[PDB]
Symmetry: C4
Subunit: 389 residues, 4 copies
């Protein structure tokens, strides 16, 4: 048992294989399944787990009514064995609140949750199942974090947090933890103008976080973090293949150093990419407008070339089915010479897109890279909304 | 691996951070959640667990009818992983009965339950999951104990017990256990006139128990225990800030050595305080009359100064919501140089305050100290009683 | 870690303290609780567990209809953590069948289940969770065994089994196992005329089995086993205090060497006693006729004195409540210089005594000896049959 | 802990003892039990587990409607403790998809699942709970595998897979894995004309797979694999006792090297045999037309003699009850000098044979060899379909 070091490069990825699916809404139609949203996965030396923010109610429960609402005192980060659906019986409460991240440093798991009212939220930082550090809101406006896993190197686990407006300049910080204790705090530097919901992964001693600009950009901000020097830079994804939602049509050229405006009607969604020269993959919703469908696009030099476009594609969720947030994770403890990219897609069901029920929840699908050329189908949620009416 | 020794001082506390919330009533509206009351938490080298007295029925079950009643042969002390709701599937039966305490001595857990008829109750003392000692009623009138954790030092774990009237002088004893075996029994001495439901914690080699005087005082009794000499003293919290329920208005001065009487309509509720000079915090219900709301008040020198008043406050449960019992615990095994105060509030739902249902149950919230100035919100139970009608 | 040796004497017993109660029928009115009967408890170095024969249906399930029937292909021996109720989610399947015993030898657990048709049943003998031995019926008429725990000494676990009529002479054998393998088989010898459902315990290198004579006696047969020599003797309890059900009134004198006959309308019930000279306790139903109530009677010299009567009594279940089978077990791994007697009472609900429901099931209560004089109350099942109508 | 090798002979078998039965459909009438089909068992050093393909819904759930369908994105291979019924709360997701195999090599478990559309399926090969290898469809027509356990020798675990028509010549391959990595791929050789759903076991350093010819043969193909040389041969079972369903009446002679045509209306079912000279047992449905009943027949020299007929029988499921798939497994880690044959029968309930419900699911029974002459009875599912109407 030892601290994870980010000593490996990313594996070559030519297609995506199925890792896990929990079928939570199908199962939750009859079994005692918690209402969730903002799911993710995170691994440790022993295996991988599913994570999400509970709403503190089952899906068929009367208290599912009103679960469109993002923030309440009844939310908590919960984790469970990958592939099961989240029930009150198989879930571990990681921390209490309505925004989270989690990661394993090789020794123990750090989990962070924000809670409180909009103007006075706070984070509690847990390590090894115990509370270590507390962080008060610095801007008084929904202190919040990644909603997917953080990444650790030599015990140092950077986390990106934001406090301030969703629709204007906000105060983003990079906090570097070790065993749950703050080693350093940096204010966001560089050319990213707005940061939400970073999706992060590590390779070759570098952590890259692909985020959501909720203010201006339909191109995604990219934060590049050195966990040894505990320093960073920021800019935007260069590619013309825009990957936030909502977004306009892809332009003839991207923009590395400024947000590309447009899209309607949504200011953003959490998403991700793996950036590795030729071996670069962008996720996005198939719909330009709404959280519908999900596709993976291989976009060589997306990080550096404004003219970069796709050379291959894999549909993950067809555009007749609802998607949601998406994020990066890696099983850093696999028995491989390279770190293999993985991602999840949150499959949102109910409100607001499906108004015939009173609730909002999700299920999860996760995939990882293959070097092979694998066939694919749509991994949509699979529940029949009419059964809940 | 070794006995806990209470070597460390209390941590400085300037505000309270969220630790856990189980949302039991919300979840139990649909899932199979046991009816409980008199909850608490207690930790050990590996972590913390929730505890409560089951009523031997689920909340939606027909047997939840009648659960306002305190004592039956169907009650048991159960424990479960912190943050989960208590189901028939995830709970450990610690012992059988209708009054309890539990604590870990660093080696194993001691749990104690009283059971039987009012005039012929008995305690069974468990250690490491096995029954060790039994104690018959000495006064033939509801032998009973703390309803929150005990505290251990060098393997010696004092427990405060009462047998006798709830509304007149009773027979309290302090029993000092080691590995579940009685080392010494003392009769209550000093100026406290009636003792119930002690909330106890340890720091700097001293155990302090903040109790309920059900006979006279709206100020709370304090028993100070030397766990090495196995002796004690008792008196009242000195502060004018009265912290029982029901209580009168706070007087000009409190009284260290006698009860401050008054209030209506109820003679008491279990509560707690942390007493450490300037670093002193008193919990109480927001209402003077009813078990509604919950507030933490920083009252420097509350233990010693009859003129001591609050210098800061944090609302835990707003006064539009039901509270209940409250009690102390500490994660004595944290990786900190001090022992950090924690507490829980029982959030009672149903009878008698909510008579539209046939049951009485609760959920739990728990918080611990922070040296930071954290923002706060209300951690009320969150269930809609109309859903249960 | 080491084979159990039955070195220790029995502890002095002056009253009985509560050990466990599962409240299964109360809980199972709403939660998913298996239908059972023929429960018992059995301990091991780590803890104690509850055992019973499942009916392969939940209590509220439609397949609970018809569960008065004793033998089907849908029964199995299940175990679970002591104090929980048996659900499909918390139970281990020990073996498949409709008659059972189980014991731990200090290293691993031996479990035995008989299954098959009446004329051609077979036992499968499991050790450490694997099947070791199979035993075909020797008399073609419901091969069957203890329905409570067996006892082990230096790795040898004797088990009493019967094959043959329930209402005439049958063929009983004592089979001596080690690691699930047959070391020796003996035909029953001595003065017991019929043997069913032995309740066995060890002390001072001797195993005593207190059984049910279903053919003649309302006095209980006693088999005394030497597990080192692998030999035995049999006779009847001497005491005039008759402990089977149905039974006649206690006569002036019992009979050590022949059945005391009579009683109406039923030929027997599984029960138990602890026999240790002056330190002897007999359990029985309070009703002479029906499986109603339960009482413990201290009967000095019950094993040797035909005139021995009770000097003490403790009501375990009041005579307004249903009881059932009862049996012996001991935590042989307690940290005590003596082995402390324990017993359970099966609390049968439903048919045939409560014919307003279509099912038969039970809950469990268990108690162990105290040297103190503890108060007592009735530990009846506690479910309202009306809720099941 | 070492790699398993197969250098023990098969135990002598004269009858079959009950190993496990989950009663899933009875329990699932009113507990949260997943809809499954294609079950099996597989063992490891610690014990044995049940496996099946979930349909990603509970049995009583509305999504159970339409579970006759074999392939969907909502299916997964799940495993659970032997004898329990499969719930969302007690099941481990081994991999995602709609055809599987699994086996333990002595060190870790390999699990394989195929998923995707009919024309573009792919296998993901897991080892020790992590994805190792992916395999694309080679024939574009439902890449698929055994639906019962594989077998490992000195690290090498062969797996039989088919891709191609169910009703014409297909492309079968034997893939040899070590720690989930491909060691070798072979195309099917020999005289078997079509291969589905192989049931495999090892003995004497050889793996024998008894399979389903879905194209022509009512006699079952037999593939003999040497896991050291990593080569194989194939032919048909010689015996005149035909063991596929549907099948004609048994002829006066079998055929070792060609399919025997006939039977109506169905082309095949997964089944199994143990082939060991005089010690040979064949399973089959009792009905020659339908998946009803199940019988074991001892057919000396079934593998080599076209005139070989039964010398003994045991009815496992009576012919008034539904059966289904059946397959081989062995506890290779038992404490015996020989490998004892075990098998399971899938007990299918619902569609198409029971059209009064909207679903298709199963329960499991499993039996192992005995050298004794044990009595038998029918181990049918035991649910009443009307309870589901
Ligand atoms: C088994 O399953 C596997 C796994 O899924 C399947 O393999 C897959 O096979 C397909 C072909 O069948 C390959 O498709 C290739 O994808 C790339 C990239 O495509 C993405 O980007 C395109 C451009 O997008 C930008 O630009 C457009 C405007 O131009 C904007 O609208 C966009 O917003 C972007 O800004 C885009 O058009 C593609 O859309 C398609 O996919 C999406 C999902 O992402 C769908 O929703 C759409 O409906 C649509 O289908 C996509 O987003 C293309 O570049 C490839 O085109 C080349 O190849 C074609 C032949 O395959 C050929 O007709 C084209 O003219 C073009 O040819 C050029 O390049 C070839 C090399 O690729 C040369 O050979 C050729 O000579 C020439 O120079 C192609 O469309 C998948 O990548 C592949 N995936 C994997 C993971 O292997 C397989 O099909 C399955 N088999 C069966 C039997 O089902
Ligand atoms: C207590 O338990 C023990 C142990 O379980 C049990 O022991 C069994 O005892 C019986 C004797 O009572 C044994 O039965 C023997 O079985 C031999 C094989 O029988 C099978 O094969 C027969 C031939 O099948 C082929 O040929 C026919 C055409 O001829 C064709 O239809 C078939 O398809 C196939 O090609 C078959 O007829 C027979 O069918 C019976 O069983 C099936 C289920 O398998 C059932 O569906 C049928 O309705 C029918 O019952 C069977 O499938 C058989 O050869 C053997 O008979 C020879 O010896 C007997 C002596 O008893 C002579 O009378 C006779 O002339 C034969 O030469 C005999 O019938 C069985 O093997 C024991 N099993 C074991 C596991 O030990 C006891 O019976 C139980 N006791 C009680 C009280 O119940
Ligand atoms: C982010 O959240 C922070 C954490 O909660 C919050 O920081 C808080 O800031 C407030 C506002 O500045 C501070 O308030 C200060 O509190 C002290 C102490 O107040 C308490 O005691 C007094 C006196 O009570 C006694 O006397 C009266 C009779 O005069 C009796 O009625 C009473 O029984 C006692 O005998 C009391 O008057 C106060 O009453 C307030 O609070 C209670 C709840 O506890 C309410 O029910 C009541 O209606 C009223 O609101 C109180 O009980 C006071 O002396 C100061 O003058 C000042 O009010 C908090 O202490 C401070 N807390 C912490 C932990 O830092 C931030 O404000 C917040 N930020 C934003 C933007 O929201
Ligand atoms: C706190 O709880 C304590 C624990 O329960 C309790 O202490 C108990 O106190 C009582 C009252 O002092 C003591 O009772 C004594 O018991 C002995 C033994 O009595 C038992 O056996 C006799 C004889 O039965 C045989 O002979 C008769 C002939 O008539 C036959 O019927 C019978 O079949 C036998 O052949 C029997 O008469 C007694 O009957 C009583 O109890 C049964 C239940 O067991 C009832 O069903 C029945 O109606 C009747 O009440 C009994 O079975 C007796 O000889 C003494 O004279 C005296 O009765 C308990 O022994 C004692 N127990 C212990 C464990 O210490 C405290 O009383 C309680 N305190 C308070 C305040 O409640
Ligand atoms: C990751 O790196 C840290 C730092 O290199 C490792 O901790 C080291 O422990 C080994 C023990 O021999 C030494 O090689 C290093 O000098 C240690 N360095 C420090 C500063 O502690 C950790 O072991 C590494 N993890 C892995 C998997 O190799
Ligand atoms: C869903 O939640 C809404 C919001 O609470 C419920 O609307 C309330 O219904 C109650 C009882 O009828 C009324 O007293 C309130 O006036 C309503 N509140 C609001 C804000 O409308 C609604 O009933 C819930 N739906 C269901 C089916 O439970
Ligand atoms: C309980 O089980 C009994 C026995 O199976 C059921 O009674 C049978 O019902 C069938 C079908 O309607 C009748 O034709 C049989 O003749 C009945 N048998 C007997 C012995 O009465 C009964 O319906 C079941 N009850 C419930 C509520 O499920
Ligand atoms: C097959 O596995 C068995 C069991 O591990 C191996 O058994 C050992 O055989 C050697 C001689 O080759 C003995 O010295 C060991 O004591 C045996 N161990 C046991 C537990 O029996 C055997 O070697 C293996 N054979 C191969 C070819 O791998
Ligand atoms: C079971 O599923 C079937 C198949 O989806 C349902 O039948 C369909 O109902 C839809 C919606 O009303 C109709 O438009 C179609 O005509 C039906 N399709 C088919 C193939 O029949 C059926 O209603 C479902 N039953 C239940 C009780 O859920
Ligand atoms: C039990 O008996 C053995 C003899 O078989 C003896 O050596 C040992 O001391 C005893 N074991 C224990 C646990 O006392
Ligand atoms: Ca945006
Ligand atoms: Ca009071
Ligand atoms: Ca009798
Ligand atoms: Ca065929």
């Amino acid at each position: 048992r030892t601290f994870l070091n980010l000593t490996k490069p990313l594996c070559e990825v030519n297609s995506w294989h199925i890792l896990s699916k929990d079928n939570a809404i199908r199962i939750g139609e009859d079994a005692h399944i918690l209402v969730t949203r903002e799911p993710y996965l995170s691994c440790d030396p022993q295996g991988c787990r599913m994570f999400a923010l509970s709403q503190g109610t089952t899906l068929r429960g009367r208290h599912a009514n009103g679960t469109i609402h993002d923030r309440s005192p009844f939310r908590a980060l919960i984790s469970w064995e990958m592939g099961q659906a989240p029930s009150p019986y198989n879930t571990r409460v990681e921390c209490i609140g309505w925004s989270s991240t989690s990661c394993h440093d090789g020794m123990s798991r750090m989990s962070i949750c924000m809670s409180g009212p909009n103007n006075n939220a706070s984070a509690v930082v847990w390590y090894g199942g115990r509370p270590i550090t507390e962080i008060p809101s610095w801007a008084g406006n929904i202190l919040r974090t990644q909603e997917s896993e953080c990444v650790c190197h030599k015990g140092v686990c950077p986390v990106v947090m934001t406090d301030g407006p969703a629709n204007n300049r906000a105060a983003t910080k990079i906090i570097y933890f070790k065993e749950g204790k703050i080693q350093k705090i940096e204010e966001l530097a560089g050319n990213a103008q707005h940061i939400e919901e970073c999706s992060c992964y590590g390779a070759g001693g570098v952590i890259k976080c692909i985020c959501r600009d909720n203010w201006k950009g339909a191109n995604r901000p990219v934060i590049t973090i050195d966990p040894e020097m505990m320093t960073h830079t920021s800019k935007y994804l260069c590619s013309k293949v825009l990957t936030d939602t909502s977004r306009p049509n892809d332009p003839t050229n991207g923009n590395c150093d400024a947000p590309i405006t447009g899209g309607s009607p949504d200011p953003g969604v959490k998403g991700f990419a793996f950036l590795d020269g030729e071996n670069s993959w962008l996720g996005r919703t198939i719909s330009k407008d709404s959280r519908s469908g999900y596709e993976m696009l291989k976009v060589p030099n997306a990080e550096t070339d404004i003219q970069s476009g796709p050379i291959s594609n894999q549909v993950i969720v067809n555009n007749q089915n609802w998607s949601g947030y998406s994020g990066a994770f890696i099983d850093y403890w696999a028995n491989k010479e390279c770190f293999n990219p993985c991602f999840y897609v949150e499959l949102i069901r109910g409100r607001p897109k499906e108004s015939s029920v009173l609730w909002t929840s999700n299920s999860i699908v996760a995939l990882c890279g293959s070097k092979k050329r694998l066939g694919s189908w749509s991994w949509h949620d699979g529940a029949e909304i009419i059964y809940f009416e």
